[PDB]
Design a protein around this ligand. Structure first.
Ligand SMILES: NS(=O)(=O)c1ccc2c(c1)S(=O)(=O)N(CCc1ccccc1)C2=O
Ligand SMILES: NS(=O)(=O)c1ccc2c(c1)S(=O)(=O)N(CCc1ccccc1)C2=O
Ligand SMILES: [Zn+2]
Ligand SMILES: [Zn+2]
Lengths: 251, 251
């Protein structure tokens, strides 16, 4: 399966033709303020240098496999553990976030994918209500260099080849996300790649993260994908809400 | 395990000493209004007279087994199938609802227990978030005989003996429930008896249903429980929220 060309995603996976898919356009006017949405809580995200983490060019994104012991609660009794993170980006002068806000696509996006503690393995969680949870944050151009991201971005040249991987030292994974864990959008959707299973809880931070222009250029310019083509515009088409309401943790 | 007497439930089921147990005390002022909570959808509940339904005295409640095809939705793509219903009640001069509202215990309470359609079996759903869903309504005293309830109450004498069961004609299950399906409380808790599995979505109707004094009496005074004892006061003490915010579908 590719972004751009065949084969169609319903052929690969029947769930990619579900009604309740991701990503979506967030329209903050229409979001339902939901005071039950408490600040997100992360434990175990400040990793030491060892053991190292596998960072892989899988042809569709760059993905960092996360170790055991990274705990994330969406709220009391809604407990998850982090599996992996990866990135969606565009090209030169072209945005590549997956979610949009009032139609606005941001330069790039980070996803931290999590498994409910009620499930041992992802294949039991797929399609199950709240079985997976993704924390999503937009990345935007800023004046300073983001040092948290530099740790990863400086290693992309090593994994330029599609299907290549490298080991990188542990870092503060939470420093790859906004500092504000209290202001966010939440909706139920899907994985954005086959098998596109539904039952996924998406939490999209209102605060963005800032990368420098070069940092964003490193991301979008370094990696290679299927064929003899660049790994760029690695975002799925926005999907209709189809009557889902997006909640907001804030008024 | 028994109602109102040892062994203490965490010795039977350590699950019963979980942090996120049911029932709870609902305090409407502290409930969070969540506008994304849409009206409950219940299709297939208007059953014809045949086939008949199993109604059992199991010593803990009276339980009606529901056939396939009672479909219920809590939200878009969040669907369920009804499995069974049962009641909780007190005794002469004493209310026996499970949930409470600002401390008020109501005469009785109906529970309609459902299984997420994302799970083929109940046993897969136990302990999984949103795997089971219960619709709860309070029953209070009112002036009129309730004719929906009369179909069950009038059959209790035939199953007075613990462990005895009877077949009853199909009835309209939706008629046992309150008027306004748009107005309810919602939180995540547990089964209210061992095994006290968590991940249960509880939806408690704001509005009640009314039964005559003679009907409540018939419910509390007809059935026999374990040993040589009266099946009465079959409710669980309310449980702390432990950070859980009860949500309300209405301002
Ligand atoms: N772009 S994204 O954030 O939504 C995303 C998209 C797809 C997938 C994942 C995340 S995944 O959960 O790691 N994952 C798990 C891999 C897996 C699939 C089946 C069985 C076992 C593991 C995905 O497929
Ligand atoms: N007060 S109440 O609504 O919350 C309630 C209490 C106890 C139980 C159920 C509901 S149950 O889900 O049918 N159930 C099912 C048990 C079961 C487990 C595996 C297979 C089949 C049934 C219960 O024990
Ligand atoms: Zn993604
Ligand atoms: Zn019950």
């Amino acid at each position: 399966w590719r972004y751009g060309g065949d084969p169609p995603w319903p052929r690969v996976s029947p769930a990619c033709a579900g009604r309740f898919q991701s990503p979506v356009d967030i329209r903050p006017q229409l979001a339902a303020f939901s005071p039950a949405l408490r600040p997100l809580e992360l434990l175990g995200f400040q990793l030491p240098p060892l053991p190292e983490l596998r960072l892989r060019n899988n042809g569709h994104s760059v993905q960092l496999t996360l170790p055991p012991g990274l705990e994330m609660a969406l709220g009391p009794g809604r407990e998850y553990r982090a599996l992996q993170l990866h990135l969606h980006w565009g090209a030169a002068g072209r945005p590549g976030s997956e979610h949009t806000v009032e139609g606005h696509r941001f330069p790039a996006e980070i996803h931290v994918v999590h498994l409910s503690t009620a499930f041992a393995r992802v294949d039991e969680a797929l399609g199950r209500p709240g079985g997976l949870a993704v924390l999503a944050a937009f990345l935007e151009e800023g004046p300073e260099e983001n040092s948290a991201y530099e740790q990863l971005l400086s290693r992309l040249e090593e994994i330029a080849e599609e299907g290549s991987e490298t080991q990188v030292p542990g870092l503060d994974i939470s420093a790859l996300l906004p500092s504000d864990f209290s202001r966010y959008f939440q909706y139920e959707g899907s994985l954005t790649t086959p098998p596109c299973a539904q039952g996924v809880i998406w939490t999209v931070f209102q605060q963005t993260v800032m990368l420098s222009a070069k940092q964003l250029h490193t991301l979008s310019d370094t990696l290679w994908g299927p064929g003899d083509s660049r790994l760029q515009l690695n975002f799925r088409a926005t999907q209709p809400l189809n009557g889902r309401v997006i909640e907001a943790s804030f008024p």
